[PDB]
Enzyme design. Sequence first.
Site, mmCIF file in Angstrom:
data_model
loop_
_atom_site.group_PDB
_atom_site.id
_atom_site.type_symbol
_atom_site.label_atom_id
_atom_site.label_comp_id
_atom_site.label_asym_id
_atom_site.label_seq_id
_atom_site.Cartn_x
_atom_site.Cartn_y
_atom_site.Cartn_z
ATOM 1 N N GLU A 149 1.227 -0.934 -0.452
ATOM 2 C CA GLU A 149 0.230 -0.609 -0.264
ATOM 3 C C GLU A 149 0.737 1.162 -0.193
ATOM 4 O O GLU A 149 0.195 2.177 1.175
ATOM 5 C CB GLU A 149 -0.877 -0.185 1.187
ATOM 6 C CG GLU A 149 -1.522 -1.526 1.416
ATOM 7 C CD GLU A 149 -2.855 -1.577 2.870
ATOM 8 O OE1 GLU A 149 -3.202 -1.384 3.332
ATOM 9 O OE2 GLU A 149 -3.530 -2.590 1.884
ATOM 10 N N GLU A 255 -5.258 -10.699 -1.460
ATOM 11 C CA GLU A 255 -6.569 -10.913 -0.185
ATOM 12 C C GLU A 255 -7.811 -10.627 -0.478
ATOM 13 O O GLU A 255 -8.663 -9.899 0.050
ATOM 14 C CB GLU A 255 -5.755 -9.734 0.540
ATOM 15 C CG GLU A 255 -4.523 -9.073 0.718
ATOM 16 C CD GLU A 255 -4.253 -8.099 1.975
ATOM 17 O OE1 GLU A 255 -5.416 -7.958 2.396
ATOM 18 O OE2 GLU A 255 -3.099 -7.951 2.295
#
Length: 356
Positions: A149, A255
Amino acid sequence: NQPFAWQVASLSERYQEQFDIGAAVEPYQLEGRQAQILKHHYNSLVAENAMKPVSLQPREGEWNWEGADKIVEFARKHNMELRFHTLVWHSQVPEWFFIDENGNRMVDETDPEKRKANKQLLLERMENHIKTVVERYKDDVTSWDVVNEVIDDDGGLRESEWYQITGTDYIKVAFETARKYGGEEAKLYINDYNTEVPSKRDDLYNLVKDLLEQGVPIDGVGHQSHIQIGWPSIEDTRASFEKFTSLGLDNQVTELDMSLYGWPPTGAYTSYDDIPEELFQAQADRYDQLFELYEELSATISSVTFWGIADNHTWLDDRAREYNNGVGVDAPFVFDHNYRVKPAYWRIIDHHHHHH
Ligand SMILES: [Ca+2]
Ligand SMILES: [Ca+2]
Ligand SMILES: [Ca+2]
Ligand SMILES: [Ca+2]
Ligand SMILES: [Cu+2]
């Protein structure tokens, strides 16, 4: 009433030669039915929390290996690939990283000579973290999430403490350090969410191209894929995978979960029994399409990992409760809260090929 996940055909075998099928886990789920589900259905694994920076080195030189080791030992025993989540992240990172030798906050430093000193001290700390971790697990890990991220949702790089202190160098250095201690056959990934959003996809593409042109050892991109029943589109998902394949990068879905809800996830159901069957059907339809895509693109995808095993344990329950005054449930998987298969399971295990 549907059979239990241990009573039905394996997901990982269904996708043999296309992509591995993984789940995110905690050490305490490695027993009983959840362990049984794992062996039966998954050929790949990742630690939901046990290997994040805060878990492994909560203070400088205090290393907490026990939970990580348990996940590694189970992967060894049951012949599962292991992805490592995660080496470098703005979240779930101990604050001791960002304090100087005087106890001061590096983000608050104003004088240039000390800012450069802080950047070198921080990179040394980061490199030591990565060296210790990778030296320990290099033979057990087959994909490394090196940085996670790092792109901002509103356009740039994320202005985290890492960025504010080191600029873009923490990313260059994390990959070069991982490659150095992991060897050439370590696969190094950059992981992110909303990689399907055109503007974020492009920012990641620009970062990665630029890093590749500087010889930074990036092997792939990780697509968290926190999706919903009606968003994002298959087209946008497709465009994302292909853009990174064009740089010669592997893609992994890292994910995956599909919320029953939109964003924000109000008003969540508070009981599993309250979820209407038409919503589960919609979830099944969408999973079918998603896994048809993956299959269309399986040369470009090495691994698809769900962020959990069954609906009884998902961070999406926390996020429902967060946005619904502390009450609320989500059901994002192909296995339900009692380990029974859902309409989604039948639709991703099946051999249907008639298009839509
Ligand atoms: Ca594999
Ligand atoms: Ca593949
Ligand atoms: Ca749940
Ligand atoms: Ca299908
Ligand atoms: Cu279909």
